[PDB]
Design a protein around this nucleic acid. Structure first.
Lengths: 124, 55, 185, 141
RNA sequence: ACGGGGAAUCAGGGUUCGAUUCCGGAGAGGGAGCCUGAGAAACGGCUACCACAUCCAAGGAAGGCAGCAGGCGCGCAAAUUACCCACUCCCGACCCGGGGAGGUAGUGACGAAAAAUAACAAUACAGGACUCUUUCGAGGCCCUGUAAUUGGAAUGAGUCCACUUUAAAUCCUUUAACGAGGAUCCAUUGGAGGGCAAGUCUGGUGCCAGCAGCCGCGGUAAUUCCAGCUCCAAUAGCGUAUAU
């Protein structure tokens, strides 16, 4: 029932990707979740859904149409080479460390108190 | 002296405010207003006595 | 230093005399006749017309064949015609001064709902827009002060998702049916 | 203007620069005397300590006893006579209560009935005196 | 009195403001001196003295929030001891690290934009354009308003999932499910002698209390006080003070 059109489509030889703005037509139902657009474009461009990085979806007032933005890469080695790692963590293939930005700074200057190899001892 | 302070307000008899149905607010207040000022008027000789006027 | 606008304008001007009873009545005529909500929005359209007049006067002072008047002249006539307040046959800068205030309120979407016979009343028109029932070119409009353009005039009808249109029944209708057969079965 | 010379600008401008001081409203705004004599000091309001409750007489056939308080401002240390505005509001105010006082409305000018009083109380003990008058709030003790 | 770009207000002239995100300058408690460097008279660098203040084992040592938060003080007067480097950029030996610069939230009726608090129908009615009737009345080809009269029709506030959103969230938008007849899911703020929109209403008070920007009202029938009723103005705002 959902239809996808492609707009502003252009390939990137400088980044080994193709990029286009997506608009989905979903009249009467919720805005389609991002994981589902992946395979629908995979059926569209004859690719695998895991190399499909879409984001930036925001439905218009009144519903029925949601304009999103998507990337399609040449291969998975690229999709991990040139990609914001936060967008990789959307797919569970990347997971950042669990140190709050505050705790890294108390540990930073507490090592500034000591001089030499004893810098690794102050941390924890 | 200043001993007779609040004399009147203290000896004014109390009358409980009687409950009344709420007035239409918003644009409905202006709809009710426009009607009983222009469309429902009746042509009568003599000076039109005020809206709150009561003799 | 922050990345933001800080560009805010007021849309109206309060009148000088606060209790001119003559002034209080034509403002009250426009409110009741066009189903407005307060004196603000009738002052708003008066402020919208105030600019266009003085923006037209300032061009009337300059000579003809002036490239500034020639470009800005029809550019202002472009917008007034595309909103169906000025007729295309009267497109000349001296006819904007003779344009009055209720010509603008005629182009207000709320009135166009009542003008096209899609609403029982000018007040019934305003609740249809505030309840997301009509649309302009496949776009559900939620605002009665929407100034409809001349070309987007014929494309006003109910949204497809509306009981008044070809959509599901409302909350009341689905509740009058639940206990209607639930009490019968 | 009297002299309409083509190059009499410094003669015309120095004149208005001189004659402006004969305007009563202008002279008080551009001299410290009005600002130093102001107990507020250009502030719209001020907090002070009430130290006694004095009753002021009216003047012209309008005869009554106006209820006021002798406030001592805490920023300067000057003593002013604020006017307890509304009816039966003197019983809210007590002695040694800090109160927000405001101008009366004529901007440094005694107002109507009361002789030589230019200040009125608006709040008492950080609760609006109007709320005490309407009964919306009451004095915490 | 930091200057300017500018801001407020205006017919034309002007008047007033500009601490404040852009540019330029100045300064890091007060003065002074200087090291290093391409660049500093640097203060999140040193050395003094002055002021203030911390730790001490009393020998000494150490300090500079007019950075982001926060506290005290001062006052009429001003927010979280939050999240993040994803954006914007900057710095480094650098694609990789860091950035209270910055971004995102919290508080926020400073202020600005949009915009709910009902719509419709029937019935009794109060009338209006039409025909008859010298009136009276009549039907309603057509309505207009009013009435805790009745009637089902429409939605959002809220609850609430899913998605989207985002660095992770939140908000908005999107989708479901519940969600209104005194639709109690109840609009205040001021005023009603004049200026100035709006009661010679009722009760109380009796030059007292009080009102009132101004003129004034009040000394026993107050259109001005205290109240009730009604009405008027603006409407999620309105009143007061002060500068202009």
């Amino acid at each position: 029932t959902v239809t996808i059109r492609t707009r502003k489509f252009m390939t990137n030889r400088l980044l080994q990707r193709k990029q286009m703005v997506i608009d989905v037509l979903h009249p009467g139902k919720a805005t389609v979740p991002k994981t589902e657009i992946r395979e629908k474009l995979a059926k569209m461009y004859k690719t695998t859904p895991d190399v499909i990085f879409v984001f930036g979806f925001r439905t218009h007032f009144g519903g029925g149409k949601t304009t999103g933005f998507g990337m399609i890469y040449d291969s998975l080695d690229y999709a991990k080479k040139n990609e914001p790692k936060h967008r990789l963590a959307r797919h569970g293939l990347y997971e950042k460390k669990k140190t709050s930005r505050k705790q890294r700074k108390e540990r930073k200057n507490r090592m500034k108190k000591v001089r030499g190899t004893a810098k690794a001892n102050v941390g924890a | 002296s200043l001993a007779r302070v609040g004399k009147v307000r203290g000896q004014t008899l109390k009358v409980a405010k009687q409950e009344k149905k709420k007035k239409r607010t918003g644009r409905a207040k202006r709809r009710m207003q426009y009607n009983r000022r222009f469309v429902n008027v009746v042509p009568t000789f003599g000076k039109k006595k005020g809206p709150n006027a009561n003799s | 230093p922050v990345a933001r606008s800080w560009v805010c304008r007021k849309t109206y001007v309060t009148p000088r005399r606060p209790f001119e009873k003559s002034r209080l009545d034509q403002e009250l005529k426009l409110i009741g006749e066009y189903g407005l909500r307060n004196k603000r929005e009738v002052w708003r359209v008066k402020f919208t017309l105030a600019k266009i007049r003085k923006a037209a006067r300032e061009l009337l002072t300059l000579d003809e064949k002036d490239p500034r008047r020639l470009f800005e002249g029809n550019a202002l006539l472009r917008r007034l015609v595309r909103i169906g307040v000025l007729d295309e046959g009267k497109m000349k800068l001296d006819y904007i001064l003779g344009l009055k205030i209720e010509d603008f309120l005629e182009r207000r979407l709320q009135t166009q709902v009542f003008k096209l016979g899609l609403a029982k009343s000018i007040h019934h028109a305003r609740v249809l827009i505030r309840q997301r029932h009509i649309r302009v070119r496949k776009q559900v409009v939620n605002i009665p002060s929407f100034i409809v353009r001349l070309d987007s005039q014929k494309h006003i009808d109910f949204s497809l998702r509306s009981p008044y249109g070809g959509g599901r029944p409302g909350r009341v209708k689905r509740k009058n049916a639940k206990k209607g057969q639930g009490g019968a079965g | 203007g009297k002299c309409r010379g083509l190059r009499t600008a410094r003669k015309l401008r120095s004149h208005r620069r001189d004659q402006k001081w004969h305007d009563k409203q202008y002279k008080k705004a551009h001299l410290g005397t009005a600002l130093k004599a102001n107990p507020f000091g250009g502030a719209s309001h001020a907090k002070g300590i009430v130290l006694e409750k004095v009753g002021v007489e009216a003047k012209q056939p309008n005869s009554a006893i106006r209820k006021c308080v002798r406030v001592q401002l805490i920023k300067n240390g000057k003593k002013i006579t604020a006017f307890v505005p509304n009816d039966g509001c003197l019983n809210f105010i007590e002695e040694n209560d800090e109160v927000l006082v405001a101008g009366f409305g004529r901007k440094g000018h005694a107002v109507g009935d009361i002789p030589g009083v230019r200040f009125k109380v608006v709040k008492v003990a950080n609760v609006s005196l109007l709320a005490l008058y309407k009964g919306k709030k009451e004095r915490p003790r």
